[PDB]
Structures are given as C-alpha cells and as structure tokens.
C-alpha cells in the first residue's frame, strides 16, 4: 500500500528498492508568439530515480526530441517515464532487480503498473510523504548534464557521495531530503548556505561540498532555519 511516516524505516531495510519522481520529465518555458498568442518550448528533462538506501540516482535524461510531433505531452510524459523505468528494470539480472518501486506522484501508478505487467512480483506503491525530488535540478552538476545532453542518455550518480562511509542510510536520506527541501523553498538562500565558505570544495567528483561532520551539523541547522523562516515569510508568522 501507500508509504507514509509510519513506515518511514522500510526505506532502509535490505529489499533492493528505488523511488521514481517524474516531476522534471516534461519541462517547458512559456512564451509569447509574434501574433500575441502563447506557446511552449520544451527543454531537456530527466526522471529522478533514487535508491534511498545507497543514494544511487539514475537521472535518465529526457531529450526534447522525444516530444517531437506528439500530442498531450503531459500525459505522454507519465507513460514515457514508466517505459524508461521498465526498461531500466529489465536490463538488470533478477537478483539485482528491485522488489518495490515507490512513485512520488499517484498519477504514475497506472502507467507504471501497466508497463510492469511482466513483473508481477514487483510492488508498485504510492506515498503520502511530500518528497523534494523536484528540486534535483537545483543541484548544479545534475542540471548541467541534463541541459547539455544532445541525445537520450542515462546519467547514474550516487547522490550520497561517500556519506555512507560515516553515517547510516536513514541519516543520509535525512541529509539529502533536507538539502533538497531547502533548495525548493528558496533556492538562492539554500545555495548561499552551501557555498558561503570558499575553502570547502564541492570536489569535482562529488555533488556536495566536502563538509566535515561538525560543518554538516551547522549546514543542516542553517537549512532547517531557512525552511522555518520561509514558512513564516510565506504565512507571516
């Protein structure tokens, strides 16, 4: 069934599993035409697929050519997502394949279920948590690879870096989800927090600043601090 705060530990047990977020698959800019009408121009997208135990993120890049000549793109995007997830699962051996796929938006349930009919033993589940995987394109190296793609492409990066050398998956998912959640509420502030210190380097090979344990505690506090404020600034509290 649905995944919520009560079964918030199942994510880190030993059933190989991935989450699927489709919020960045079909992306457009809206603009005026010469005649004064409105049109859309698609830009590259990605499906944010995340192993929340290991942090592996399969950023299947959706090149704008996939929309060419198609109608009802917002509907197609959900079926394109399900097709690509199904293809991903099929490329793996059975033992390497996951046991559950959790979709972040309920509208993905039917497309994925239909694409996964060949896999009756893989549970397709919704969730009630408000998960911040739409903010994945606020991560500079992820946005860069999506925007540079000239063809369909798979960009698989472990979003936990080497964080699992020092902390548990539960904590790693908590750090990642708070980092992502902050970026969604106020991207500029969140990014300032993360880079305000020039001596801490997002190493070339990692998506996150090489913080020490103590520095991560400060960063996390600053991010929870941002989310708090924006909540007030939004509601005036």
């Amino acid at each position: 069934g649905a995944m919520n705060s009560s079964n918030y530990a199942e994510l880190f047990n030993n059933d190989i599993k991935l989450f699927v977020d489709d919020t960045n698959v079909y992306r457009v800019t809206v603009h005026k035409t010469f005649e004064g009408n409105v049109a859309t121009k698609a830009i590259n997208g990605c499906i944010f697929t995340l192993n929340p135990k290991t942090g592996h993120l399969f950023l299947k890049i959706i090149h704008t050519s996939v929309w060419a000549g198609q109608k009802r793109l917002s509907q197609l995007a959900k079926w394109k997502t399900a097709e690509e997830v199904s293809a991903l699962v099929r490329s793996l051996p059975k033992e390497e394949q996951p046991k559950q796929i959790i979709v972040t938006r309920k509208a993905m349930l039917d497309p994925l279920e239909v694409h996964m009919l060949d896999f009756p033993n893989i549970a397709i589940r919704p969730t009630e948590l408000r998960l911040p995987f739409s903010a994945a394109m606020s991560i500079d190296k992820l946005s860069d690879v999506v925007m540079k793609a000239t063809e369909p492409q798979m960009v698989l990066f472990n979003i936990y870096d080497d964080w699992l050398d020092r902390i548990s998956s539960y904590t790693a998912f908590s750090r990642l989800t708070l980092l992502l959640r902050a970026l969604k509420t106020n991207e500029e502030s969140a990014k300032m927090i993360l880079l305000s210190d020039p001596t801490i380097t997002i190493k070339s090979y990692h998506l996150w600043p090489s913080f020490t344990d103590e520095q991560w505690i400060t960063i996390e506090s600053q991010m929870r601090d941002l989310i708090l404020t924006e909540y007030g600034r939004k509601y005036n509290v």
Binding site: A82, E83, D110, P111, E113, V114, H115, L117, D118
Partner: protein, 300 residues
C-alpha cells in the same frame, strides 16, 4: 403459450416471473404460472417471506423441456425439475388449469420490455456461464461469486463470466502500453469480439444476462461484469456503428426497468459518469444519457 406447474406452495414466498412478481401465502392453493411467452428465456425467482436473505431463481426456456417447481423441505427451497413423462405433464397442467389454480403471465400486448432485456440472451450461453450440465435450466442466487471474484471459493457454484481486466497482459499489447490502456479498441475488437465472443450478439447476451442477475438477485459479481462490459465498449475509440446503436438501446431498457430504489447499489457512479461524459462514446448513447439524466440525475 407454455406453463410452469408448481407441485404446491408450502411456504410463504414472493414469486417473480421475469419482471413480474406476486405474493403467495403459506399453503395457498397456488399451482403455477401459465401463458408464458414462447421464444424468450425466462427466469422464475423466489424470496421467502421469512428470510429476505438469498433471492434465488432458475433461468429456463420452455422450448427445451417441460419444467415444474416442487418445494424441497430438506434443502428449504423451491426447486425446478424437468417432467420426462409428457403425458403426466399435460394431465397435471390441464388439471390445475381447469381448477384455475395458476396465475397468468401478465404481459401487456404493447409491452416489449422483456424482449428488449433478453434480445441476445440464449439458454445455451447461460448454461456455459452456469455449469450444471444435467439440467436444462440454470440456478442463480444472490451469493454466487464469479470466476473472476474467486481469483482475488467453490468452483462448481460459480458464475463463469468472461474475465475482463483492463490491467492485464490480455488487454495490453507489449509496446502499445499507453495506446492500449487509453484506447481499449484492440482488447474489445480483437481479443474479446473476434477471439472470445466471436460476434457482438454473444457479447451483448452476456452483458444482458449479467444485468438481469444483478437486478433480480442483487448478485454483486454480476453487477461488476455488466459494468466492465459497458466500460470496455465506451473506452474504445473504434467500435462498429451498429454496436453503439444497439448498446444505446440495450442500456436504455435496462435503466428504464431498474427499480428507482435500487439505483444506489446497482449503478456505479464512476463507470456511468466516465461512459456518458468522458469516454470516446460519450456522444454515442443518446437514449441512455437522456433517461439517465431524467431518472437518476443525482448519480451524475
């Protein structure tokens, strides 16, 4: 005009014959139903006065044999049996007919309701849905489950309706997932009509039989099947024109006949709103949409 003689009426019971019904008192001198129109299937059904639980009944066709109803006190129900002595049958019927111990199938001459509800229903197909091969008639009741229901528990007492499942490999061609799920024309025309039912008359016959079992017995699995067969047509972009026009007629008379007080349980809001207002065929069912809007506007 044929006859179903009754050996007696030892327990108080409401007896239905097709869309008609009448109350028989305990040990009343009731000995059957006469003037039954030849050419159609019929259903004779029962609701005991003391136990409104379990409506039950028998589908039959008087062209296929001489049938009588005898209360069995051990099993506690009105059974239908076949008389194999044609001389006994004529003698027993004539006897009861001369003493005026039978009710007359009370059809109005203008009234084509029963024909319209059973146009495509044949006994031979009923007997494949209700498997009891030693009888020429078929027993159904409120509690019998369908083969599809049993997959999600007595197989001999099941309704063997054709399994329809929109999220199944039968319904969805590999590589056409989105196309086949959002437009079920393949599943309707190739899998069901060409492959399984062979023609639209057999499809409509099962649809009509499912509705009648839902209406007369409150059989939940039958109601599921009726709605699934409607939804499969309405969710197909490509349906033969004669099929759409015939479905409109079929549903019109089903909706006309439904008791106004049973519409809350026999009609599925989602299916009907989808079929009438959202589906490919939302503009193809003019007669059904008009009677639904004037009779059950609350549902919509």
């Amino acid at each position: 005009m044929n006859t179903v003689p009754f050996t007696s009426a030892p327990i108080e019971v409401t007896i239905g014959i097709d869309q008609y019904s009448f109350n028989v008192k305990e040990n009343q001198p009731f000995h059957g139903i006469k003037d039954i129109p030849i050419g159609h299937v019929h259903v004779i059904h029962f609701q005991h006065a003391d136990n409104s639980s379990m409506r039950y009944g028998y589908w039959f066709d008087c062209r296929m044999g001489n049938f009588y109803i005898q209360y069995d006190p051990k099993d506690g129900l009105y059974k239908m049996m076949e008389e194999r002595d044609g001389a006994k049958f004529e003698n027993i019927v004539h006897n009861f007919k001369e003493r005026q111990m039978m009710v007359s199938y009370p059809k109005i001459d203008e009234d084509d309701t029963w024909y319209n509800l059973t146009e495509f229903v044949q006994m031979d197909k009923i007997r494949k849905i209700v498997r009891k091969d030693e009888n020429q008639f078929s027993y159904v009741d409120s509690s019998m489950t369908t083969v599809q229901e049993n997959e999600l528990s007595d197989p001999a007492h099941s309704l063997n309706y054709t399994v329809i499942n929109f999220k199944s490999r039968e319904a969805i061609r590999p590589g056409h997932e989105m196309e086949d799920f959002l437009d079920k024309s393949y599943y309707l025309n190739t899998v069901m009509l060409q492959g399984i039912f062979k023609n639209s008359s057999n499809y409509f016959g099962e649809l009509q039989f499912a509705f009648l079992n839902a209406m007369f017995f409150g059989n939940y699995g039958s109601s599921l099947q009726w709605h699934a067969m409607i939804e499969l047509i309405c969710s197909s972009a490509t349906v033969p024109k004669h099929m759409l026009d015939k479905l409109d007629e079929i549903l019109y008379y089903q909706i006309k006949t439904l008791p106004e007080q049973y519409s809350d349980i026999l009609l599925n809001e989602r299916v009907w709103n989808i079929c009438l207002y959202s589906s490919f065929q939302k503009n193809s069912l003019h007669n059904t949409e008009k009677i639904m809007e004037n009779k059950y506007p609350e549902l919509l």
